[PDB]
């Protein structure tokens, strides 16, 4: 059936910022956080199933 979607007004800008954070780290003023690899997560979180 039909679906209802609530998109943000600055979607295009937010998507470009999501990439520009990695493309220009000293340039993009994006929020900083602990890298996933350095967090207390199970060893299996980064070793994909074989």
């Amino acid at each position: 059936g039909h679906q209802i979607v609530h998109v943000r007004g600055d979607s295009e800008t937010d998507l470009e910022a999501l990439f520009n954070a990695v493309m220009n780290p000293k340039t993009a003023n994006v929020p900083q956080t602990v890298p996933m690899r350095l967090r207390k997560l199970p060893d299996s979180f980064f070793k994909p199933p074989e």
């Binding site: 943000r8 937010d14 990695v22 199970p42 299996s44």
Partner: protein
């Protein structure tokens, strides 16, 4: 598996369909589920990656039920060349309900898009089945995949996906009770067998 005695996730897939001509059809899966004891993750380690305002992950986890909370780690298959980008999911319940599926696309832990789909039970094989077939992907997700595939190396894509999360909440429309919540985290797959995944139970401590 992902599920409580009230609702169970049977199948999930995010795909790209391509029809070169009326005689040729192609379908590529980026991620899939459904094609013994789950490892646990302290939910406090991921709260910052998901919305935390009125109706956020911490709020929903506190209200509960806490067994409905799962964290899914995906290794998305991006090895792919008219097109349709869609999502197919299927839930199962013993009781007849009207479910509401909220899918929040999150960037830096903040909601950017919200797909909301009300689904109804169809009694198949002794139980109630809620199926969402070929749900169109939003323009944010389509352009995101296009921009991810455009990066020259895989390590770069994993770095961008580091601030990209999806929060899926399935709720009893009448009761407003959380039936199932899946917090999704992504990496790019680097395997010959393609898309892989790991599922964890989200716990308080």
């Amino acid at each position: 598996s992902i599920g409580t005695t009230k609702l169970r996730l049977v199948e999930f897939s995010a795909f790209l369909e391509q029809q070169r001509d009326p005689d040729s059809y192609n379908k590529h899966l980026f991620v899939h589920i459904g094609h013994p004891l789950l490892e646990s993750v302290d939910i406090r380690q991921i709260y910052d990656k998901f919305p935390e305002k009125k109706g956020g992950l911490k709020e929903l986890f506190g209200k509960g039920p806490q067994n409905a909370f799962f964290l899914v780690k995906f290794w998305a298959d991006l090895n792919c060349n008219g097109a349709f980008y869609g999502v197919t999911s299927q839930y199962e319940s013993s009781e007849n309900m009207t479910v509401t599926c909220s899918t929040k696309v999150c960037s830096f832990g903040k909601q950017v898009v919200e797909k909301v789909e009300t689904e109804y039970a169809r009694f198949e094989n002794g139980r109630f089945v809620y199926r969402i077939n070929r749900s169109p992907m939003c323009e944010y997700m389509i352009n995101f995949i296009h921009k991810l595939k455009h990066l020259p190396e895989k390590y770069m894509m994993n770095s961008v996906l580091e601030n990209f999360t999806i929060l899926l909440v399935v709720t009893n429309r009448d009761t407003q009770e959380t039936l199932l919540c899946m917090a999704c985290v992504f990496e790019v797959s680097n395997s010959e067998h393609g898309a892989q995944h790991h599922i964890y139970r989200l716990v308080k401590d």
